[PDB]
Design a binder for this molecule. Structure first.
Ligand SMILES: O=C(O)CNC(=O)c1ccc(S(=O)(=O)N2CCC(c3ccc(Cl)cc3)CC2)cn1
Ligand SMILES: [Zn+2]
Length: 113
């Protein structure tokens, strides 16, 4: 069970978001088609970090956090009617976003589908 993010209630999502499709994404910075994270502020789709065991992606999502400070991202492919995998870079943990349905609706994602 994951704790509520300090960012979840007041998260600012940028105007003119993309319509994020239900499948088929790519990292906007490399050819990764798996392990992709949607930043809930700006709708960027970027790959996951390289772990110290050498597993994972090319760090594009975490590099974008370092540049923007936009702290919440959701792992694409984990969204269900029951929730999703949400990471907070600032809190450095998996978190609960009680405003997830609103935050995903901003991108045209209906988690109930
Ligand atoms: O990548 C992004 O840009 C966004 N996400 C993260 O930064 C991130 C960081 C930590 C975590 S974790 O603490 O839940 N946990 C995920 C599984 C991981 C691991 C690797 C490999 C094996 Cl075999 C077992 C276990 C250990 C850590 C989850 N996501
Ligand atoms: Zn990438």
């Amino acid at each position: 069970v994951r704790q509520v993010s300090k960012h979840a209630f007041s998260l600012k999502q940028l105007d003119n978001p993309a319509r994020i499709p239900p499948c088929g994404w790519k990292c906007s910075k490399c050819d990764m088609r798996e392990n992709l994270w949607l930043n809930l502020t700006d709708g960027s789709i970027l790959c996951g970090r390289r772990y110290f065991d050498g597993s994972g992606g090319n760090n594009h999502a975490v590099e974008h956090y370092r540049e923007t400070g936009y702290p919440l991202a959701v792992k694409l492919g984990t969204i269900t009617p029951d929730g999703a995998d949400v990471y907070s870079y600032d809190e450095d943990d998996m978190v609960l976003d009680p405003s997830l349905a609103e935050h995903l609706s901003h991108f045209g994602i209906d988690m109930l589908k």
